[PDB]
Amino acid sequence: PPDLRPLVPLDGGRFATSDLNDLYRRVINRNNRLKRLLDLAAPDIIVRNEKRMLQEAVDALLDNGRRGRAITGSNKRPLKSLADMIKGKQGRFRQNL
Amino acid sequence: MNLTELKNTPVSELITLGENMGLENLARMRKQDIIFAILKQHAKSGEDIFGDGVLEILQDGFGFLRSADSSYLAGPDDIYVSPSQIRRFNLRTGDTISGKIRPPKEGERYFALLKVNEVNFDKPENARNKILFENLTPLHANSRLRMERGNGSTEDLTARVLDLASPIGRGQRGLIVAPPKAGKTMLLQNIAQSIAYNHPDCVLMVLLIDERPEEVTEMQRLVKGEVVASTFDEPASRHVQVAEMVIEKAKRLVEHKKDVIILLDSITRLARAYNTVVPASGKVLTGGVDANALHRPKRFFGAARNVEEGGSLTIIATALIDTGSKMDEVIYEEFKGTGNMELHLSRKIAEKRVFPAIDYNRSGTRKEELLTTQEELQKMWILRKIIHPMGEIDAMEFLINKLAMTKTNDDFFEMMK
Amino acid sequence: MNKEILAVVEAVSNEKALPREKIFEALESALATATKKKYEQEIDVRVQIDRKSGDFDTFRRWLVVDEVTQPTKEITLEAARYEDESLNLGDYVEDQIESVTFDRITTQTAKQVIVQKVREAERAMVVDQFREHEGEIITGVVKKVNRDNISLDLGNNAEAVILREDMLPRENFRPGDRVRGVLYSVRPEARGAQLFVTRSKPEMLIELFRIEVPEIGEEVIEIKAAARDPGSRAKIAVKTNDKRIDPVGACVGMRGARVQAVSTELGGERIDIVLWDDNPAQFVINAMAPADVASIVVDEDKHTMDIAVEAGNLAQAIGRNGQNVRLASQ
Amino acid sequence: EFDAIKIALASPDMIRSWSFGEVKKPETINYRTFKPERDGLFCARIFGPVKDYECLCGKYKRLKHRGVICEKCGVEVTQTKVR
Amino acid sequence: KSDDVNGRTKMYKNIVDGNHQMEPGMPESFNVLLKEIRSLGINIELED
RNA sequence: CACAUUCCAACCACACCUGGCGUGUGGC
Ligand SMILES: [Zn+2]
Numbered sequence A: 001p002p003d004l005r006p007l008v009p010l011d012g013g014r015f016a017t018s019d020l021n022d023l024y025r026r027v028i029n030r031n032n033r034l035k036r037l038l039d040l041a042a043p044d045i046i047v048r049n050e051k052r053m054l055q056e057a058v059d060a061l062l063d064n065g066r067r068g069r070a071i072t073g074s075n076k077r078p079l080k081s082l083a084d085m086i087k088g089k090q091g092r093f094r095q096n097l
Numbered sequence B: 001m002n003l004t005e006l007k008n009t010p011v012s013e014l015i016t017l018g019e020n021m022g023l024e025n026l027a028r029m030r031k032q033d034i035i036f037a038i039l040k041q042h043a044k045s046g047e048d049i050f051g052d053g054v055l056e057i058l059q060d061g062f063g064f065l066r067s068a069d070s071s072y073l074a075g076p077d078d079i080y081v082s083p084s085q086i087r088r089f090n091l092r093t094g095d096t097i098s099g100k101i102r103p104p105k106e107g108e109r110y111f112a113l114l115k116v117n118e119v120n121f122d123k124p125e126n127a128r129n130k131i132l133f134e135n136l137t138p139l140h141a142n143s144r145l146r147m148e149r150g151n152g153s154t155e156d157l158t159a160r161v162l163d164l165a166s167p168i169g170r171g172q173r174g175l176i177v178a179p180p181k182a183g184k185t186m187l188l189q190n191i192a193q194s195i196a197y198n199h200p201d202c203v204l205m206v207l208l209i210d211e212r213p214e215e216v217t218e219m220q221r222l223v224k225g226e227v228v229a230s231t232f233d234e235p236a237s238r239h240v241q242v243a244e245m246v247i248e249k250a251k252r253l254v255e256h257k258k259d260v261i262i263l264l265d266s267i268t269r270l271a272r273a274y275n276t277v278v279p280a281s282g283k284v285l286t287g288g289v290d291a292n293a294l295h296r297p298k299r300f301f302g303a304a305r306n307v308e309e310g311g312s313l314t315i316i317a318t319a320l321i322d323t324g325s326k327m328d329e330v331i332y333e334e335f336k337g338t339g340n341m342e343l344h345l346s347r348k349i350a351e352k353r354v355f356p357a358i359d360y361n362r363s364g365t366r367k368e369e370l371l372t373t374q375e376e377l378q379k380m381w382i383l384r385k386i387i388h389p390m391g392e393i394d395a396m397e398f399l400i401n402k403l404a405m406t407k408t409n410d411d412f413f414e415m416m417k
Numbered sequence C: 001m002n003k004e005i006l007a008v009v010e011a012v013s014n015e016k017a018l019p020r021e022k023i024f025e026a027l028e029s030a031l032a033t034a035t036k037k038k039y040e041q042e043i044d045v046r047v048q049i050d051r052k053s054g055d056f057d058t059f060r061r062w063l064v065v066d067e068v069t070q071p072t073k074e075i076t077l078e079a080a081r082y083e084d085e086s087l088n089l090g091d092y093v094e095d096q097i098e099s100v101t102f103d104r105i106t107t108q109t110a111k112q113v114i115v116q117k118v119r120e121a122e123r124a125m126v127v128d129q130f131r132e133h134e135g136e137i138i139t140g141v142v143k144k145v146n147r148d149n150i151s152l153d154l155g156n157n158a159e160a161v162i163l164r165e166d167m168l169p170r171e172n173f174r175p176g177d178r179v180r181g182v183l184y185s186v187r188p189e190a191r192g193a194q195l196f197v198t199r200s201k202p203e204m205l206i207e208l209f210r211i212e213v214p215e216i217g218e219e220v221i222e223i224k225a226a227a228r229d230p231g232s233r234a235k236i237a238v239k240t241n242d243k244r245i246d247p248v249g250a251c252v253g254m255r256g257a258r259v260q261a262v263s264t265e266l267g268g269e270r271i272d273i274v275l276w277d278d279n280p281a282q283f284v285i286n287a288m289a290p291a292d293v294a295s296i297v298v299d300e301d302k303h304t305m306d307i308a309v310e311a312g313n314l315a316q317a318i319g320r321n322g323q324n325v326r327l328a329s330q
Numbered sequence D: 001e002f003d004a005i006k007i008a009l010a011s012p013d014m015i016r017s018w019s020f021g022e023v024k025k026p027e028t029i030n031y032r033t034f035k036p037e038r039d040g041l042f043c044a045r046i047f048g049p050v051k052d053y054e055c056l057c058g059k060y061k062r063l064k065h066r067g068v069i070c071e072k073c074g075v076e077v078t079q080t081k082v083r
Numbered sequence E: 001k002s003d004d005v006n007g008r009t010k011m012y013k014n015i016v017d018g019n020h021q022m023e024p025g026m027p028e029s030f031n032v033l034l035k036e037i038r039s040l041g042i043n044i045e046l047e048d
Numbered sequence F: 001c002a003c004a005u006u007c008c009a010a011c012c013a014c015a016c017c018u019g020g021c022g023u024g025u026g027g028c
Helices: A019-039 A044-062 B003-007 B011-020 B031-043 B083-088 B157-165 B184-198 B213-219 B236-255 B267-277 B292-302 B326-334 B374-387 B393-405 B409-416 C002-010 C020-038 C104-131 C202-212 C259-265 C280-287 C320-329 D012-018 E007-016 E028-039
Strands: A007-009 A015-017 B049-057 B063-066 B079-081 B096-102 B111-119 B173-178 B203-211 B228-231 B259-265 B305-307 B312-320 B341-344 C141-144 C149-153 C159-163 C181-186 C195-198 C221-229 C233-240 C270-274 C297-299 C304-306 D005-009 E042-046
Touching: A019 A044, B003 B031, B003 B049, B011 B031, B031 B049, B049 B079, B049 B111, B049 B236, B063 B083, B096 B236, B157 B184, B157 B393, B157 B409, B173 B184, B184 B203, B184 B213, B184 B259, B184 B312, B203 B213, B203 B236, B203 B267, B213 B228, B228 B236, B236 B259, B236 B267, B236 B292, B236 B312, B267 B292, B267 B312, B267 B326, B292 B312, B292 B326, B312 B326, B374 B393, B374 B409, B393 B409, C002 C020, C020 C104, C104 C159, C104 C181, C181 C202, C202 C221, C202 C233, C202 C259, C221 C320, C233 C280, C233 C320, C259 C270, C280 C320, E028 E042
Parallel strands: B079 B111, B173 B312, B173 B341, B203 B228, B203 B259, B259 B312, C159 C195, C233 C270
Antiparallel strands: A007 A015, B049 B063, B049 B096, B063 B079, B096 B111, B305 B312, C141 C149, C149 C159, C181 C195, C221 C233, C297 C304, D005 E042
């Protein structure tokens, strides 16, 4: 849900966004690029690489860092995924339940 | 029990009538509360009411029926109408409607329209079979609207010079250009009288925007026709409101194949109003007028045209000049070349107390060849050639004398030979 | 700064309604009050902002009197040899100069006193331009009603007050109607409403005739005597300078055509139109009219008049509240 | 009120039933105006009205029009808690 | 006292009116967890 | 004719604010 995604208007034109927003946006971007490439009859290797990249994006959105490459979104720090919002001493169970 | 029957009679008749009906002192209430309480107490005896009024569209969807007693404004006696009636019977602004009405029911505060009986003096069955205004094919004026009475009274001269200076027709576009206190009011009154006498078939309406109340009360009982007005007692919101009311009434009536003639006084007041109610758009020129502040006067004036299928809409407005403020001038400026007929009155002639003070050659009518015949046109050209070399004032006096010797303009034309 | 002063004097809405001279006078009063509130001592100060040549310069008024209380504004009527007075009265000094006129409290008091001065000036102006028409019938919509007074608008923010004594006891008011009366009193120094319009007074009747009767206004039928009872009855004696004109057919009208109109204007007031006469006898007979008078007693020492009415016509000569007599006494 | 909780796999049809719309634009909001995107990550007709009892286009903002959608944006006017 | 979006208001209204009685409702953060698990490919559901 | 709502003397509705996340430091 949108309001369940942290996004608050910070001081100035910048907005305090969540780590899930970047994940969802990258997923949507790669999905749209894949849909475009499928219509233009892209080469088999190109659509193969695009499917691989979309798979990387969706598994990073699911559980970042589990695949092996912990991607960062900002500050060169590990990004927060959906699994991270449940596990550890910072998930919902340990902090909000 | 009809709404107009209490709408037109003066306040005194309402007083005696309510005092007869055993009322609380009605002298403490307004005219609208007078009619409201009287209709309340009449329906409390068990009568189904009939009413009439001009419709106004609101942005919430529903409509309200106004009268000419309130000059088409909000009042306690306005008749509420649902949007679904506006849908089924195809209602819109300007549609005058008369039919079955009841007072507001339990918890309501405005009358409700039960059953439509007359839409713009027509059967509500054919009211859906109407032609729109913008889809009309305008034309020039062909039918002549003779303004001369022929009785030869003292003031009738100010009408005959009309037939000699600037001809009028059904659907004409006329602009009165005159400084203040030159004689526009008496001219307009004579225009209204002559039209109501010679052409009682066409509906006659007059606009008074930001005028004095004495002029309003003298106008409403001098002309044979339903008049609407708005003095300076009220904000410009009232002026623009009555402006849509009257213009949409004229539009719907001409859509019903009727000849409408509107006399507007004055267009300068209406332009000031339209400018002061319009928000600022960042486009300001000399005088203090917004660039889009004139779109509404342009709309109201371009509403005039001559329809081909039947009916026409003549709009004759007066503009004010020489008022010391450049803003007024700028208004007249954009209204310089927009009209095809003009009545130019110079203060130099009115300064000698010789009436009517009309500038002959500065006045004229475009495409006037289709309004008059060949003999009349040739005689007009000869008169213009005779009056052109002379000045304004005593040349107007010459026309006044040549007009006063003869009874109607036929004798004047024959003498001019 | 002074540029702000010029921007203020040029950014006013009612520019001619309150001209530059009186604008700068109000600003001088503002700066004087500011300087007064600056020092703990009370001292009168003139500013002379120099409307177009230069900036402001405060001064120090003396108010020359033989007192010594707060000598900042005290000096004797004879101190004139040194400091170059040479006067008897009005000796003021120009010692303190160049005060501050833009801080917080100065801006506050300036705004307040400017609001007060502009509203007072505009009220006095809109009342004074109508003062020339004192004693005439005017139109105008009412503004607000109350149990003590009502407000009326004559157009262009023309505020007029009508007190309870000017209103009839059962006169009817509602915001929206045009109650017409006659202007009778003006007080251009009043802190509040000062335009006084009445309808209960007999002069209005004259003005009523002045707007209804064409005979009056040409001094052919002079209105001499007039007494009133609001909403109940008005007794008027009008004389005829000519001989072929009868007020019963001229001032009354044609079978109640004018008397009825002025009664409806006055809210149902009985109007006894009689003739003024140079004889007290006929005058009091017409005063108690209609009746049958069969007696006249006059006393100039006590200024009394005895009228023994006929037996039976009591209600015809006295009636309710003795109005037919009371108005005669009035 | 309710008994035990059940958990299982999510069928694609079940997800589509849960879905009140589809996000196609990768944009969340605009820089100048703080109103949400048309059908981006933050939408109105998909999730709900950003404000309480006020639509996105501002046409249906009164409590009388509460309960219906608009003709252009099509946002069911209700409380923002539905988001 | 913490999570009920509609209980804390009701409890405050009852207390200020002299009513010391509560209503369980449902914790909002629990619905948040339900939505988060639902956001995954996992279906969580409350029975009867 | 019917469905459906009705735009304004105090005032009820138009309220009130950054732990998103990390880092550093200190205390128990
Ligand atoms: Zn909307």
